[PDB]
């Protein structure tokens, strides 16, 4: 893959996103199901359904609050396996068609109980303030009920892993030790946090090249 | 034009047919459109069976006369049990949707008699679909005995006690998936011999 700066109309086809990991809150069954507890007499009283987390993706338009992109949803495996997918998905709007004003959004719909399946909400930005679309690169995010977002620290380290994809000056022995850095990214699994009312997800969308965007 | 866009294949139009089915109330015309959507559901059951799931889930919003077609819809649920796991969840959504408003007691009694037996799967959605059996039983004593025949819960009393029953019904489907792998392996094996003992 090659990095290069390529503007909106200059860039050709529609976007796609691969999505992989999350952060277990540990407050419930690992699928974020039913809010497990010894008080479960109340769980029978509250009729708490066991929800298997699934996901959905659609983009909030321009921050103009219109609707453009397509909602899309995938299949179901254990979310108690923390549903690590790296699964690609897409919709029908090109980069040439894509307005530099645009924003991603996602809703995690679990599968809970009678007429019941959960719903969680999040949103983010498509391209950079530097116009590069998510720097055409890997990322990680965090979201609460409303007004929450993503940062980069360990995700900044992961962004440096995306700088390995972003083609900083590189060599062949460096590549073998980048297999050793597959061992290092394997070691990166050590991460720990226990927040609430909010959650984290690891989502990589590294492309070949840095987009740029403009009008038609 | 609607039937044309629906027949077009560009699966995005099929998802666009959802809002069409939502606003279809203005059109009081025949079931021919639903038949075209049914053939579309078959052709989807051929290739785009994942999308067939999402379409069928939305297809439960029909809410139309001639309940005799709902039996073919149940057969379409049995056909939805084919492969896609999303089709199972969709069929569960249709199961709850049908659980809200019923049609025929006896046919749905035998239906649910098989379905609840097939609802013992440990899948997260399968449990949700299994929970609809109690809601079905709400709509008495003869049915209580008939259900007690296949009942897996000795201590069952009510809805909460049915929740405790499902809590005692906890099982692992991993070995069941491996058993399915053994079933496919048997399908790859030789079943030619019908001999016994």
């Amino acid at each position: 893959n090659n990095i290069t700066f390529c503007v909106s109309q200059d860039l050709d086809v529609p976007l796609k996103v691969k999505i992989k990991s999350l952060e277990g809150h540990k407050p419930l069954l690992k699928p974020s199901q039913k809010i497990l507890n010894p008080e479960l007499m109340l769980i029978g009283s509250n009729v708490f359904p066991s929800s298997d987390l699934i996901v959905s993706l659609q983009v909030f338009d321009k921050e103009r609050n219109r609707n453009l992109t397509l909602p899309i949803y995938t299949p179901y495996i254990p979310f108690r396996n923390s549903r690590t997918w790296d699964y690609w998905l897409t919709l029908p709007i090109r980069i040439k068609q894509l307005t530099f004003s645009s924003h991603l959004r996602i809703i995690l719909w679990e599968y809970n109980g009678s007429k019941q399946i959960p719903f969680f909400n999040l949103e983010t930005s498509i391209f950079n303030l530097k116009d590069c679309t998510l720097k055409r690169g890997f990322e990680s995010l965090k979201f609460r009920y409303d007004v929450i977002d993503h940062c980069e620290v360990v995700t900044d380290n992961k962004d440096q892993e995306n700088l390995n994809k972003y083609f900083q000056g590189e060599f062949t022995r460096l590549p073998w030790l980048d297999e050793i850095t597959i061992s290092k990214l394997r070691k990166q699994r050590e991460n720990r946090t226990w927040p609430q009312g909010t959650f984290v997800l690891n989502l990589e969308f590294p492309m070949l090249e840095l987009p740029v965007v403009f009008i038609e | 034009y609607v039937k044309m866009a629906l027949l077009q294949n560009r699966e995005r139009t099929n998802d666009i047919i959802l809002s069409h089915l939502i606003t279809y109330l203005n059109d009081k015309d025949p079931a021919l459109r639903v038949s075209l959507i049914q053939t579309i559901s078959g052709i989807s059951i051929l290739l785009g069976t994942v999308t067939l799931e999402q379409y069928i889930l939305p297809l439960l919003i029909q809410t139309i006369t001639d309940s005799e077609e709902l039996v073919v819809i149940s057969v379409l649920q049995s056909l939805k049990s084919l492969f896609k796991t999303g089709l199972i969840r969709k069929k569960y959504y249709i199961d709850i949707s049908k659980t809200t408003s019923p049609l025929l007691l006896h046919p749905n009694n035998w239906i649910r008699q098989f379905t609840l037996m097939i609802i013992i799967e440990i899948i997260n959605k399968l449990s949700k679909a299994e929970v609809y059996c109690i809601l079905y039983p709400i709509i008495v004593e003869f049915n209580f005995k008939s259900m007690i025949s296949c009942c897996k819960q000795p201590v069952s009393r009510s809805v909460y006690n049915l929740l405790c029953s499902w809590s005692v019904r906890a099982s692992k489907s991993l070995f069941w998936k491996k058993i399915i792998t053994n079933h496919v392996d048997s399908f790859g094996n030789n079943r030619i011999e019908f001999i016994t003992k």
Partner: peptide
């Protein structure tokens, strides 16, 4: 003995194709 195992699913590419 037995031949190569049969997977129940296959991974998308999305990498070199990009």
């Amino acid at each position: 003995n037995l031949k190569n195992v049969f997977v129940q699913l296959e991974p998308t590419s999305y990498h070199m194709h990009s």
